[PDB]
Design a protein around this ligand. Structure first.
Ligand code: IAT
Ligand code: IAT
Lengths: 237, 236
């Protein structure tokens, strides 16, 4: 990606570009009857996540620097990052719902409704903890879209590895700009940058555990998975 | 009230440099399969014993409850072994320097299932550190961040909130220290925040290699010490 537009954006244009790329907030096409079974819970989340994936593909294309890559590399990055991206989206929209996960405006679950599925309460607790940390830090929308982009570009990274590195540097510059603009001292900026990036290691962690569980669910044959979802799972073995 | 929070950048580096565990040699006899895992398990078990003593010397660690120190080490131990390996393996392209007397390349991983994928990720991590010219002082800051960070969001009472808050104050201190080192080396502010980000993004790859590694360590049971058996009960 030598010569790329992405690398000569201002911080403010990078943010404008990322804001314009944002997917819509999806409603669940079903309201659950009450209570949940394993199968009804995994049905709602699987259905919601398949629909989110379609919109995440359109978003990825509008991320500066993403479409500079080979289609091969674009596929690898989304295959590696998709559940981290669903997760950062979930913890962001759950920030104003303490103790609750806003899967959709018509699908708000507390940690208890996680108990009907094996291993799910542990994940919910880690998602809740991440949401609470974002609330404590007062994460801003402009910071969130920068982080979501870092996840996409970073999660499968290990000309075209150096290109991804130059785009990641540009997104770092953007976060620091946003922070300076908001009146943080140079010390507060560097500290907040580190705090946000250390949360990406927790999101990577939740994704690796999530994927283990999706693979167990696959073999269990509890719910139909879409061909797309099966592709994403085969990618992780 | 932690003394960690009173240290200068230079004092934080000294404390972390002085905490470094000893360099271990492999002491398991050179079949070539049982014996690959044997090599690594015997070496890893011994490194773990020295990691427990290193952890007590990481500024801020000793201020935590015993229960929290245990949780932190159960979460971070494999990440800490892996960042050590990738540090030692920098000057040895295409190889993993497990010990001064135990240099493997990715072909050796083949003797075990799913180990070559981990070795490729470890090797690629080692090359990225080399490319970046990672300094010893940065490496010790990164290793301490992994210990304090990896378990912080999986501790819930009034005491825990104090614990989490102490950890966040110490992490901010280590952040100040990394920046100081970078400015000391004459990086511009821009280069400093870019280098900080590059280093911290690698930590998310180290977490990923640890998650993948713990999967294969758990299935490996399905010749391990009670210590290693204990450590797998955490990551169930
Ligand atoms: O870690 S999870 O809680 O997932 C499982 C736990 C146990 C199981 N077992 C099922 N049987 C046995 N175990 C199976 C799965 C994982 C994170 C979160 O809960 C899951 C999930 C999700 C993704 C894709 C999918 O198809 C179905 C579910 C989430 C999610 C996040 C954001 C979003 O916008 C939409 C969905
Ligand atoms: O991610 S791994 O490659 O782990 C496994 C992969 C496949 C297996 N399979 C076993 N059967 C089939 N696959 C089993 C485990 C992990 C990283 C590296 O190789 C392993 C290992 C290690 C740690 C502890 C232990 O008790 C036994 C082995 C390493 C290590 C790293 C730094 C260090 O300083 C010392 C040791």
């Amino acid at each position: 990606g030598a010569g790329s537009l992405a690398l000569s954006l201002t911080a403010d244009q990078m943010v404008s570009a990322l804001l314009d790329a944002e997917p819509p907030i999806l409603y669940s096409e079903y309201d659950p009857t009450r209570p949940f079974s394993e199968a009804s819970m995994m049905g709602l989340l699987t259905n919601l996540a398949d629909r989110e994936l379609v919109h995440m593909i359109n978003w990825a294309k509008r991320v500066p620097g993403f479409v500079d890559l080979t289609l091969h590399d674009q596929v690898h990055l989304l295959e590696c990052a998709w559940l981290e991206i669903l997760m950062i989206g979930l913890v962001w929209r759950s920030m104003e719902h303490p103790g609750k996960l806003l899967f959709a405006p018509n699908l708000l679950l507390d940690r208890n409704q996680g108990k009907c599925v094996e291993g799910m309460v542990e994940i919910f607790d880690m998602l809740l903890a991440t949401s609470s940390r974002f609330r404590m830090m007062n994460l801003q929308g402009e910071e969130f879209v920068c982080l979501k982009s870092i996840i996409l570009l970073n999660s499968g990274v290990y000309e075209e590895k150096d290109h991804i590195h130059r785009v990641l540097d540009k997104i770092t510059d953007t976060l620091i700009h946003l922070m300076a603009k908001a009146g943080l001292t140079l010390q507060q900026q560097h500290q907040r940058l580190a705090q946000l990036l250390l949360i990406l290691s927790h999101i990577r962690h939740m994704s690796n555990k999530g994927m283990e569980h999706l693979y167990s669910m696959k073999c269990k044959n509890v719910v139909p998975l879409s061909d797309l979802l099966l592709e994403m799972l085969d990618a992780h073995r």
